[PDB]
């Protein structure tokens, strides 16, 4: 429907509570993967002056604008050491996305 | 009575003195929780140009408009490290709300 | 009846009390949406010299003249973060509109 | 005599010279205390467009109208860091009030 | 027809909703490219006092006046990291421009 | 013929539509250049109380009275960043002036 | 002779040219000092709708009526930062007053 | 009296000079004890970007808000190696608290 | 002739074009030197709400009123890092002053 | 005479040139001492957004309002490492104060 | 012609795209060389609060005002490690300067 | 003349290029000698977060404020191992100081 991109942002915002847990790996993951999408300076803006949680908040705020908010998901499969739980997170993400999709169908 | 929402604002204003103590965690708490209710840019407006107390003042001013001024309370239970006193604050909040409610019954 | 446009203004005026709560997002919402209807300079007139509530008052005064006072409603659905309560506001708006419509039928 | 309220305004005006010194803390003090009496938008009117001294002038102009011009005094005791001199100011205030009161007795 | 410049402004205004997504890179992009067209102080006016979205609004308002509203497009190709979606935006821009052009032909 | 000064005013009025585009730089340009001709307080009158377009209108109204309505043109060459289009404007200005001059010759 | 009050007005009018230089501090000085003599609303009338020089003109027009046109002089000594020249102005004022006084003696 | 909490803040501020001596152990003590009360990210905010004394200043600023400013005292007994003098500090703290308490009784 | 003060203002206005280059150091220079002459609040008025060039414009407008428009020159020698060119500016200033002085002699 | 407080401000302003040298230790000194007088948030306002010299300027501006502008002097004796020259500064301060005092005696 | 200084600014602005590449060495180069011309605090303003590219933008904005925009070039020869390409940059700079010079000759 | 202190700062700034060579021994020399003058925390500020050259830059920036910029020279004689060249540096320093002194005599 070309609106699943929009509902991805809503799913992200509903899931922004789970930021604190596993976006501590923000620089660990996205600064090296999502540079395919994220701006180079944006990594510096995220990292330079924040307090390591709000830092992830700004990361996800930059992510919402992109329609491919599944880029973090795709990166998450990489570095499978963290994925034992972060795949639990991708399942949580897919569950929220499915709930919002079911609402979208109405 | 559907007016407890309104008296919540009065309780907040009477309790706005206690802002300085534990809304220093404004960005620590609400920018990551109340984004469910607060506007995304509103976080930027709160944070970008203020002096870290008046900043909390603008946060609570944005909060008064919402009827669910208990969202800060709900978030406050999360991050229980601060809650040893901030639950003392939720008790203070409930006490003020109860006083205003008793006045409302008259 | 082509008069629902007129009764929309009456509903707005009866509902102008609720301005203070959620038209604080005036520049947040309408300056970027209702520019489809609002004049470009009108945004500057609203914003430049006022005190952030009367500012919303002038916004709604400019809105009354337009028949499509549902443009603010349509915009309100966008930015769903604020809509948890602002949809409560669209329900309030629809309730007032329905009351005035029932009066119009008489 | 129920006129001490009126003579409080005269004492304030005679003491409006001392505005420049310690009403620089206008937003620091009253925007968070005297919101119990001051209008919410009035804080925005004071702060938004002025030059940080005349700003305090408008604050005190709004204060004169209230009979409880001792609200600033009561707030002044709070935040005792500034009170080392601002209590010297409350003594100055009480001295002016006493002088005007003695004139009132005549 | 020398009027495509004018219809570019209409296309921009119709597309001003998509501001929030990828003009967050306003200072990231235009302050360093469109200084070829934008005024030097205008960068300071955009950046100094706003809230990071309305900031982009003022940027696009300054852009509408220029006929070469394709300067942002030309800059957008530069910094291809953001272009994975921002080229989706240039396609969206070209689509809106084509729609308005077809209307212009009538 | 010493009347080209007069026809300059007519050309300006015919061209007053193009005010909105690039006299947004009114304070950016003339308040610092045309102070050679414009009154010092006149800058304050233009800037202090208007809405940023009508402001330019009053600027051009003050300009019509001066015969040297080419002062804005001369200033326009300065700050060449804006001149990529504003020279398109000086060409437009010269075209209108030439048309009116040809009418004057009759 | 109880007429020096009257000749003070003449000295002021002869010296009204020097208004533009250092009554730019009108709100800076008199709105906070001469409120001892000037009407409270008169400050609002001076400030609200003028163009920052004529504003000082209305200030001095209100001053002429008062016999104590030395109140501005007394205030001028306060805020000695401006007094390096504004005392040159009080010397100019005293010189004009002395000239008019010598004429008065005749 | 339920105000000893408040006077604890005053005692702390009066004792903030002694910060430099033995809050150099800020990360040594509180980041591992007062995490029972201090926010997890707050440790990162304290540590990441400061200069090891002002760092302790921000620590104590976060401590003032908590009523249990005796948490640092309780932690101080732990790690008795530093307590040979830091108990001299707890005696100093208790002395200041007793002085302020005696003032409170008045 | 005691009129060189007046011709200094004319030289300044003729030289107000060179404002944009090296009065960017307005707060860098005058807010810390010319506070000997400039009003304390005037620094706040200059700095608080402008766009960093017009800001310098208001600075020079406040400077024209003072006869000692050489105060900026005297300050300019201080902070010799900028003086490599700003002394070129003092030479330019002296050249303009000399030209106007030669005109004054006529 | 109870006016030495006022002349202290004049001495400070005359001595505000020497700010740049040894108020670089602003956060080093006053944020930990003058918190006895300075507001807690005022430290944040000074430090958060400035450029490390103007920062000291705002510090001294906050200091002028206090009559006890000798608090910085008293603190200066503490941390004697800097006092080898900063006592030369206290001698300079006392010299300026003595000069202004001699002027006050007149 | 004494205007090559001015055309240097135009060459810089045309070359401001190449900022991102090798003004990353801003603090590496100019904070230690161009302190001969740049203000001492200006280094702090550049460095303290920016995001490492816009930082270079402000650096070059401060550079444009100086006529000796070849100071960066002269410094660039120093630290020849970076010069393998940065001399390619000085050649690019000289090429742009030569192009603008040829335009200037016209 | 009591101004040789000031010209010492100019000599230092002219000699700040030679920082990179032999202030690499910053922590090696001054953190253990100039603690007689440098602040204790200032050593931590210099060392903790920089990149070992800019670190020396901040060291010399702290040094300029002190009049006894010969303290580094006095320390330099100590640790004669480095002095084989660093005395060549003290000769260079004395040469620059002598040049500036000769300029001062003029």
UniProtKB/Swiss-Prot annotation, chains A, B, C, D, E, F, G, H, I, J, K, L:
Changing residue 37 to A: Abolishes cell death-inducing capability. Changing residue 43 to I: Found in a mesothelioma sample; uncertain significance. Changing residue 92 to E: Found in a MALT lymphoma sample; uncertain significance. Residues 4-92 form the CARD domain. Changing residue 32 to Q: Abolishes NF-kappa-B activation and homo/heterodimerization. It is found in: Cytoplasm, Perinuclear region; Membrane raft. Changing residue 44 to A: Abolishes cell death-inducing capability. Changing residue 55 to K: Found in a MALT lymphoma sample; uncertain significance. Changing residue 27 to E: Abolished homomultimerization and formation of a CBM complex, abolished ability to activate NF-kappa-B. Changing residue 22 to R: Decreased ubiquitination and ability to bind NEMO. Decreased ubiquitination and ability to bind NEMO, impaired ability to activate NF-kappa-B. Decreased linear ubiquitination and impaired ability to activate NF-kappa-B. Ubiquitous. Phosphorylated. Phosphorylation results in dissociation from TRAF2 and binding to BIRC2/c-IAP2. Phosphorylated by IKBKB/IKKB. Ubiquitinated via both 'Lys-63'-linked and linear ('Met-1'-linked) polyubiquitin chains in response to T-cell receptor (TCR) activation. Ubiquitination is recognized by IKBKG/NEMO, the regulatory subunit of I-kappa-B kinase (IKK), and is required for TCR-induced NF-kappa-B activation. Linear ubiquitination at Lys-8, Lys-22 and Lys-54 is mediated by RNF31/HOIP; linear ubiquitination is recognized with much higher affinity than 'Lys-63'-linked ubiquitin by IKBKG/NEMO. CARD11 is required for linear ubiquitination by HOIP by promoting the targeting of BCL10 to RNF31/HOIP. Changing residue 8 to R: Decreased linear ubiquitination and impaired ability to activate NF-kappa-B. Homomultimer; homooligomerized following recruitment by CARD domain-containing proteins that form a nucleating helical template that recruits BCL10 via CARD-CARD interaction. Self-associates by CARD-CARD interaction and interacts with other CARD-proteins such as CARD9, CARD10, CARD11 and CARD14. Forms a complex with CARD14 and MALT1; resulting in the formation of a CBM (CARD14-BCL10-MALT1) complex. Forms a complex with CARD11 and MALT1; resulting in the formation of a CBM (CARD11-BCL10-MALT1) complex. This is B-cell lymphoma/leukemia 10. It comes from Homo sapiens (Human). The lineage of its organism: Eukaryota, Metazoa, Chordata, Craniata, Vertebrata. The chain holds residues 10 to 115 of 233 of the full protein.
